[PDB]
């Protein structure tokens, strides 16, 4: 693209006309040139640090050294955006000067001095100088962005290139986690990018003040010195409000972050909460957090109703100070219209820099902080500079104190080696040091297999799963060969995981997705090492982490056959010593040092063996549903009328300003300008407050409705709709309709209403401007239409690109040692350079579409400058300066009307998402009985009779149960189990009225269970699900939040199950804070909670579900506790997954394929009778 078209961005016009017909994929906005690559700018930045580190005798990359490196690498493009910025501003100054000339040669009637003695000629050299203000400004806007975006590119790389060299010690990685370094990439790097977006402004704005002082002084005098003083002495109090805002905004963010964790506990555990009638309790727990978040957002709203106010009010008071002082104090050269209507444009220019100068110096401070943060990061610990270890002294402390010394390990090729020892014997540490991740104080680790290192498979003890498909987490960027994959899937039993998944092999696994079971997470990680065909496999306790027992057998039987056939050496540390003297050339270490090394028989001969023997639609419906529904007329009409009346005062302040300059009735000129500008200032306050106030009153009554109509939803909705869908619209859309909409609402409602106002001023000054504006408005309409359609697409394509980049900066940090273990640095390196260049190429075209709008809209506005000038002069020879000082603003109103309109449109779409949630409601609470007199004090008879109940979920073709009849009498503790995919889970949940028994009758305790309120039913019948999680809170509160029974009862209930020793000897006791997920009590504690809920509710019935995978001793203890629970209750209808605990029953119903297969009234005849014994064996 040449200089004729690069300055107007003509190449966008073929990109925005296609973006209207089709949408924009990444294949549409695809190519990214050589100069704007992440790699190229990274090569430039390496050259900068190399040439510095050649030049600098003083070594390290301190904050001084980074800024010298950035300057030497990016100076030649920053000077071209500050030179163009100084010229765009200085040519901008000519615009006020021309207004002065036009009005002087209007009214009361060498050749070049007379050439600029005109008003026809002076408009043309005004018009053909604004085309240079408005093209140089954009050229320097874009060069700043293009250079700024490049720093995003070559700092995210140069951050990531140290993530490839960071040491995973308990010092370094223990201090800074992935959350610290992710907000370096996310939060910090953006505010260093944004410093180079604003880097010319701190150079240019001091020129603007100096010339702004000088030209205003030449136009009006020493009174201009008094006037421009009042702005520059209200710029630091613009800073104080902008400081106190960001102080309060951090508070609001760190407060609603704690809310979102509470909301995550409610949405993730809505299943167990709804069954235990505990949705209302957690609802009122998040609402009080919303009360405290609302008083924090109120302080945000107070300190942002001043920022708008200070921006508008401070210049107007400054202008009135200038003129009234130039009238009251001394009027020598009074306000002739050439002077006054020209120095309004000089202030209307210097409105903008001085109150944006506060927020530049803000973003210079943040840049100083950011290179402090980045240099303190970028001086972290480097890593370093078959396996045979000779001396083997190696530490995690970077000076002294080896955690493993005297390590003389020998592992020649063609091998299979187990490593066993005590929990804490330097065993996991030996493998990571062997891989080359710990500092060899003495010795060496040598190598020659199939200086010079080797790619080695690795399984971490804490398993790591990248956010991808489970197949893709298994394949791990390796060529898919479905025969190797098939063997892996069966061996680790990935078939039940795929079937239980919503998607199977396509399921989003790991983090940010399905938070799988810890054994299931371990099975995924274990399989990747086997699949990868790496030349050596190091497994760090897969068998000690192996949850599935037969698969643990099968793992070893697959790992033997895989190691022997591949002849891939395998070092498998574990302290499960089942295979340990058989055929492993074992290497046992103790207390950090190797204790014995040799063959297995040698360890039989060393007497430690005995120890082993032991898409184009605007949304006016959502905007109407936002304002008129939530806010109410009592402040919707006040906001809509104060906007118009503030915006009729701004023409009335200007219309009377014109009609005084003609006279240049003097104290009446003063007493209406003071009494218009003061009420103009007053209306500024009461529109800036009323906008932000309406935002708070709509944010509250949206979120309160959203919570209290999603805690009124069936659980079938929670299984049908994903919990990421509800939580995203919950969390992110509430942030937009609180923190982002009302400021945009006030800014758009100020700008576009002023835009019509400015085009009203022009059309009455030249009252045949209607002919002039009708063709030009149409072009303004079309650029509006093709910009919204375009820059919505590139907006979400910006935002949905940033998230896979920062998720890569999480997944690199957490599973770091895997990537360095496979010697796999350069293949997660290149995934960054695709992720980086997918973000910059969707941010460059976002800004190039932004600049295309501004170049095109300003040229529309510059046509308004020449036409308003030309038609008004030819009228006024037959209020012209005031009309002409508005035409300059119109070029910079049409921009921001369109810019806010697109942004408001994008933000408005976050209200339609919330109203789509507010139309999803079911699962009524009605009791069609005598609702307090027909139920007695407690239904706890235990007589749960089923009469042909036909129940289902799919509601269309698929029932689960049919024709079922079962009448467990009071005390008939009838543990009913049937076919494993048929109906068992459905049976337990449906009993709590949570599934559609489409016929029949299911009576419980003499009352129909379909004709009771859900709150009454669910409270009065306890349960215990398969393997639930814990709500974070106080221990009595977690056990029973709305208890009101007794504290002694809570102790008796907690002791009666288990863990009373750990409950009493906890550091908290009865108010012990559950540490965010139940990582310190038990799985038994859920049964304890169920026992406490059962006893406190004073019921007899209980429906109890299965148990997933735990200590069977604890499960027999649970079964004995269930017997103890029986020896209080004596009635329980308890399903079970493994039938061997269910063989101690009092009646048994066996269900096959989704029907009743057997109903054995004793449980011992079941062993005699063939169908039931076949399920028993």
């Amino acid at each position: 693209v040449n200089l004729l078209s690069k300055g107007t961005y003509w190449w966008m016009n073929a990109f925005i006309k296609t973006a209207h017909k089709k949408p924009i994929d990444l294949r549409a906005i695809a190519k990214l040139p050589i100069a704007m690559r992440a790699l190229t700018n990274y090569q430039r930045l390496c050259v900068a640090f190399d040439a510095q580190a050649r030049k600098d005798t003083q070594s390290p990359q301190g904050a001084r050294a980074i800024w010298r490196a950035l300057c030497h690498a990016f100076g030649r493009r920053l000077i071209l955006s500050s030179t163009f910025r100084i010229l765009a501003d200085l040519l901008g100054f000519a615009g006020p000067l021309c207004i002065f000339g036009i009005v002087d040669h209007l009214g009361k009637e060498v050749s070049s001095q007379e050439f600029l003695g005109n008003a026809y000629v002076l408009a043309v050299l005004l018009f053909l100088a604004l085309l240079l203000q408005r093209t140089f400004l954009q050229a320097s806007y874009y060069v700043a962005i293009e250079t700024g975006i490049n720093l995003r590119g070559a700092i995210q790389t140069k951050i990531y290139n140290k993530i490839m060299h960071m040491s995973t010690s308990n010092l370094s990685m223990g201090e800074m986690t992935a959350g610290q370094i992710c907000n370096l990439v996310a939060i910090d790097t953006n505010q260093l990018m944004w410093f180079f977006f604003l880097c010319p402004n701190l150079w240019t704005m001091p020129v603007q003040i100096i010339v702004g002082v000088i030209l205003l002084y030449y136009i009006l005098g020493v009174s201009a010195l008094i006037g421009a003083a009042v702005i520059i002495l209200l710029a630091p109090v613009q800073y104080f409000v902008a400081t106190k805002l960001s102080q309060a905004q951090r508070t609001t963010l760190e407060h609603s972050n704690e809310r979102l964790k509470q909301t995550n506990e409610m949405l993730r555990g809505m299943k167990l909460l709804k069954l235990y009638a505990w949705e209302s309790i957690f609802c009122s727990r998040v609402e009080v957090t919303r009360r405290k978040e609302m008083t924090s957002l109120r302080a945000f709203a107070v300190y942002t109703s001043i920022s708008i106010f200070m921006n508008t009010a401070i210049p107007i008071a400054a202008v009135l100070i200038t003129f009234v002082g130039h009238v009251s104090f001394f009027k020598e050269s009074d306000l002739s219209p050439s002077v006054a209507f020209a120095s309004l444009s000089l202030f209307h220019i210097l409105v903008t820099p001085l109150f944006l100068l506060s927020s530049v110096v803000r973003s210079t401070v943040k840049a100083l902080v950011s290179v402090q943060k980045l240099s303190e990061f970028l001086s972290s610990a480097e890593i370093r500079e078959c396996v045979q270890i000779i001396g083997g002294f190696f530490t995690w402390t970077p000076d002294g104190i080896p955690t493993l010394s005297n390590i003389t390990i020998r592992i020649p090729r063609g091998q299979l080696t187990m490593i066993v020892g005590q929990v804490g014997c330097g065993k996991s540490s030996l493998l990571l040091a062997t891989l080359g991740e710990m500092q060899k104080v003495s010795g060496a680790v040598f190598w020659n297999s199939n200086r010079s290192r080797g790619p080695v498979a690795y399984a971490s003890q804490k398993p790591w799963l990248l956010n991808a498909t489970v197949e893709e987490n298994i394949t791990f960027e390796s060529p898919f060969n479905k025969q190797r994959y098939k063997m892996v899937i069966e061996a680790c039993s990935l078939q039940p995981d795929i079937d239980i998944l919503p998607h199977g092999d396509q399921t989003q696994i790991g983090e940010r997705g399905i938070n799988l079971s810890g054994g299931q997470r371990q099975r995924i990680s274990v399989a990747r090492a086997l699949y990868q065909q790496t030349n050596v496999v190091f497994l760090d306790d897969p068998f000690s982490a192996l949850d599935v027992h037969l698969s643990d057998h099968l793992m070893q039987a697959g790992i033997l056959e895989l190691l022997r056939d591949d002849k891939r050496t395998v070092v498998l540390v574990t302290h499960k010593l089942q295979y340990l003297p058989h055929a492993d050339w074992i290497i046992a270490m103790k207390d950090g040092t190797i204790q014995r090394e040799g063959t297995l028989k040698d360890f039989q001969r060393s007497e430690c063996q005995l120890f082993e023997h032991w898409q184009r639609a605007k949304i006016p419906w959502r905007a109407c549903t936002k304002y008129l529904s939530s806010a109410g007329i009592l402040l919707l009409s006040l906001l809509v009328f104060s906007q118009l009346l503030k915006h009729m005062v701004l023409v009335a302040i200007d219309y009377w300003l014109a009609k005084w300059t003609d006279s240049a009735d003097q104290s009446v000129y003063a007493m209406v300008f003071t009494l218009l500008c003061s009420l103009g200032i007053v209306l500024c306050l009461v529109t800036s407050v009323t906008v932000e106030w309406t935002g708070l009153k709509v944010a509250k009554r949206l979120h309160r409705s959203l919570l209290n109509r999603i805690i009124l939803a069936p659980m079938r909705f929670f299984e049908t709709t994903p919990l990421g869908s509800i939580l995203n619209r919950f969390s992110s859309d509430c942030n937009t309709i609180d923190q982002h909409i009302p400021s945009t609402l006030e800014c758009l409602s100020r700008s576009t209403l002023l835009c019509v106002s400015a085009l009203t001023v022009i059309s009455y000054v030249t009252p045949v401007f209607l002919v002039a504006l009708l063709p030009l408005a149409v072009v303004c309409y079309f650029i509006q239409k093709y910009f919204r359609v375009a820059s919505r697409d590139l907006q979400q394509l910006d935002d949905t690109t940033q998230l896979p980049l920062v998720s890569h900066f999480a997944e690199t940090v957490e599973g770091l040692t895997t990537i360095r273990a496979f010697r796999y640095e350069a293949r997660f390196q290149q995934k960054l350079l695709e992720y980086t260049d997918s973000n910059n190429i969707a941010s460059l075209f976002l800004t190039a579409a932004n600049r295309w709008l501004e170049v095109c809209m300003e040229y529309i506005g510059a046509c308004v400058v020449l036409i308003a000038a030309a038609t008004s002069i030819s009228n006024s020879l037959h209020l012209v300066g005031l009309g002409l000082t508005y035409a300059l603003m119109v070029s910079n109103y049409l921009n921001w009307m369109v810019r806010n309109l697109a942004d408001m449109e994008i933000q408005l779409g976050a209200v339609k998402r919330i109203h789509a949630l507010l139309k999803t409601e079911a699962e009524s609470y009605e009791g069609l009985l005598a609702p307090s007199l027909i139920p007695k004090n407690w239904p706890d008879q235990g007589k749960i009779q089923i009469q042909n109940l036909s129940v289902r979920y799919d509601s269309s073709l698929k029932p689960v149960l049919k024709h079922v009849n079962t009448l467990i009498s009071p005390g008939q503790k009838i543990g009913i189990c049937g076919r494993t995919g048929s109906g068992k889970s459905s049976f337990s949940l449906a009993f709590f009225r949570m599934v559609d028994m489409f016929e029949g009758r299911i009576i419980i305790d003499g009352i129909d269970i379909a004709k009771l309120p859900l709150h009454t039913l669910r409270s009065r019948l306890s349960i215990i699900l398969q393997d639930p999680v814990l709500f974070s809170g106080t221990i009595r509160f977690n056990l029973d939040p709305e208890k009101k029974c007794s504290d002694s009862t809570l102790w008796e209930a907690l002791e009666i199950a288990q863990l009373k020793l750990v409950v009493k000897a906890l550091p908290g006791g009865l108010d012990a804070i559950i540490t965010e997920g139940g990582e310190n009590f038990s799985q038994g504690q859920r049964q304890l909670f169920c026992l406490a809920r059962a006893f406190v509710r004073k019921t007899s019935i209980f429906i109890m579900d299965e148990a997933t995978a735990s200590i069977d001793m604890a499960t027999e203890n649970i079964l004995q506790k269930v017997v103890m629970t029986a020896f209080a209750d004596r009635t329980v209808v308890t399903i079970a997954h493994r039938v061997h605990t269910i063989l101690s029953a009092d009646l048994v119903m066996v269900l096959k394929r989704g029907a009743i297969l057997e109903f054995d009234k004793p449980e011992t005849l079941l062993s005699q009778k063939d169908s039931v014994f076949a399920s028993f064996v």
Partner: peptide
């Protein structure tokens, strides 16, 4: 900047996977 999409951004926000 009469319109406010200004350079005072809170950069960090968390959004889970769509659908």
């Amino acid at each position: 900047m009469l319109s406010r999409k200004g350079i005072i951004p809170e950069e960090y926000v968390l959004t889970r996977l769509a659908e």
